[PDB]
């Protein structure tokens, strides 16, 4: 790249123009010259012209700066004269701007579409006044005719039934075309996440000038997979896990999840079903039933819930529901981190004696609110999501409490192609007890869904050890044989307060897309957060568990890609800021069925 000269440039210096050039190659020079034209044209230089170039020197003629003199409106305008004026009113004496003129024309083209004028013809006719360096604008506005939509049909649906897609369009048959309204169907289908691609075709009806059809074409994406396996041997015994997940079960519009596992120590089973359209106008219902347990202590629980909800406007919805869970435990490792709650809740077990039990059957009410303007189902580029949910216990339950969880994320593009995007994510977790009691010990909040640089469920306050433990060695502090005093432990318990945030810089992967045809992104990330224990009695203690400022941090690189078996993700993190009880991790590899 060599020195670039501009001659005939007197209102500006060289850099004022060069900063918009792609050179600090001939085939693209016009795009900088047109930029140069806009630079001048958008500043009133109605006579600005490109005269010649040589290879680099650009020889230009600099004219004067023109003002607008006024605007004339003509053509087959079927009313809406005031609205047309709104698109044409200017401040007398304001600077001529060619882009503004084009914009005004496009605004007219758009405005008339909602009234059935699918194809208006609008032409600007600028007039240059040299006696008075101004431009007068005349526009010929031919509104055109009125178009009605006769049939709307879909092609390419092998699994989904049409009853689902016709729920998403806002343009309905038997009415005039709003050329702008049909396009919202693309967003609706994109939000469902059921398709590889969606597009549209507006076509004229050959039988008459006033009828059109609207055709949508989609390509269905795989909606879920079944996973089964059992680990079996003559020494291993039986280790079972299986389940199925479909987001559009055989295309019926229902979401179904069935999972479970069985082994010598823990049991899980959970089934959930939901219908996004119980009613024709979008009322949704669904719920689930679960069971689980653990055997060495012993802990068993089970429960169920049902949720109903509905949209309240084009972009927002509410849901709420009821359910309950039974909880029982016995022979649990004694822990003062729990005792100061259990005794506070009225429990009076022997101190440091594992031989104990506790069980309740607690009924609760849950609710939440969401906001969603995200523009894609898999690779968001714009919009944001807000998910505020929480639950409060139902009077008559044994554990009376409440908790609220907030999860937000925002995507803002940088470039016109949305190849680079700024992404923010934040988590909040707060709650408290009711009736003078404390929060459940099992509601405490590390992992791939949170600060990446630490081991899963390791962030926060740790347990301590102290009567009886009948295992023959492993901790001296756990038993009367070796314990002498209050002991530290690396066993995390989490806590009743959480604050976590992360930031990602999403970039394109042209060095990968050159080889692979699927959707792939890479991002740079930072994450950090902390968990703490509100009302921890630090006066008796050791680290202070009430301190909310002990924020820990990690950062690294994340990769996002789709595969035939569903989305998969991996990121590599490097922890940088840590506190005591550090249990770091860096290789985060898991299923991509997230976000």
């Amino acid at each position: 790249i060599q020195q670039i000269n501009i001659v005939g440039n007197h209102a500006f210096t060289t850099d004022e123009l060069i900063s918009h050039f792609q050179l600090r190659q001939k085939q693209k020079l016009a795009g900088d010259l047109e930029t140069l034209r806009s630079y001048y044209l958008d500043r009133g230089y109605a006579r600005f012209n490109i005269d010649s170039t040589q290879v680099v020197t650009v020889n230009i003629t600099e004219g004067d700066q023109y003002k607008l003199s006024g605007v004339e409106v003509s053509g087959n305008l079927a009313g809406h004269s005031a609205e047309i004026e709104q698109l044409t009113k200017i401040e007398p004496g304001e600077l001529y701007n060619g882009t503004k003129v084009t914009k005004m024309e496009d605004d007219i083209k758009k405005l008339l579409g909602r009234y059935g004028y699918a194809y208006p013809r609008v032409q600007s006719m600028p007039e240059i006044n040299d006696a008075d360096k101004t431009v007068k604008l005349r526009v010929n506005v031919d509104a055109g005719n009125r178009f009605y939509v006769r049939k709307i049909r879909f092609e390419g649906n092998d699994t989904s039934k049409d009853a689902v897609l016709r729920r998403e369009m806002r343009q309905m048959e038997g009415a005039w075309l709003g050329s702008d309204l049909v396009d919202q169907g693309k967003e609706r289908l994109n939000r469902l996440g059921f398709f590889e691609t969606v597009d549209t075709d507006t076509q004229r009806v050959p039988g008459s000038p006033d009828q059109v059809d609207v055709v949508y074409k989609v390509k269905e994406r795989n909606t879920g997979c079944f996973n089964f396996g059992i680990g079996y041997g003559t020494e291993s015994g039986v280790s079972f896990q299986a389940g199925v997940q479909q987001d559009n079960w055989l295309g019926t519009g229902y979401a179904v999840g069935i999972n479970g596992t069985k082994n010598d120590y823990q049991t899980y089973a959970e089934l959930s079903v939901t219908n996004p359209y119980f009613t024709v106008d979008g009322v949704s219902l669904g719920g689930r039933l679960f069971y689980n347990d653990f055997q060495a202590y012993t802990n068993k629980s089970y429960g169920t819930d049902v949720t109903l909800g509905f949209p309240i406007n084009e972009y927002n919805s509410l849901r709420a529901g009821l359910g309950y869970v039974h909880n029982s435990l016995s022979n649990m490792q004694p822990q003062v981190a729990m005792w100061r709650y259990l005794y506070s809740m009225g429990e009076h077990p022997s101190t440091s004696d594992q031989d104990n039990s506790f069980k309740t059957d607690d009924f609760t009410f849950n609710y939440g609110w969401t906001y969603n303007k995200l523009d894609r189902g898999y690779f968001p580029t714009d919009g944001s999501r807000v998910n505020l949910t929480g639950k409060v216990t139902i009077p008559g339950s044994d554990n009376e409490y409440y908790k609220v969880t907030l999860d937000t994320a925002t995507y803002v593009p940088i470039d016109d192609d949305h190849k680079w995007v700024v992404l923010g994510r934040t988590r909040w977790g707060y709650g408290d007890g009711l009736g003078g009691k404390e929060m459940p010990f099992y509601e405490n909040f590390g992992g791939s869904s949170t600060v990446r640089g630490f081991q899963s469920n390791t962030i926060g306050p740790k347990a301590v050890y102290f009567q009886a433990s009948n295992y023959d060695p492993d901790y001296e502090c756990a038993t009367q044989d070796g314990a002498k005093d209050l002991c530290k432990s690396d066993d995390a318990v989490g806590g009743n307060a959480m604050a976590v945030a992360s930031l990602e810089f999403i970039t394109p992967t042209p060095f990968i897309s050159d080889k692979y045809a699927n959707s792939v992104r890479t991002s740079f990330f930072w994450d950090m957060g902390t968990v703490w224990d509100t009302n921890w009695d630090s006066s008796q203690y050791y680290p202070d568990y009430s301190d909310p400022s002990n924020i820990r941090m990690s950062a690294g690189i994340a990769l996002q890609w789709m595969s035939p078996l569903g989305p998969l993700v991996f990121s590599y993190a490097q922890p940088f800021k840590k506190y005591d009880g550090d249990k770091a991790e860096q290789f985060q590899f898991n299923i991509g069925k997230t976000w």
Binding site: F226, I230, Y232, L250
Partner: peptide, 10 residues
């Protein structure tokens, strides 16, 4: 001894 598994997608 064995870790039998299979996958079927929808």
């Amino acid at each position: 001894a064995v870790n039998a598994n299979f996958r079927y997608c929808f």
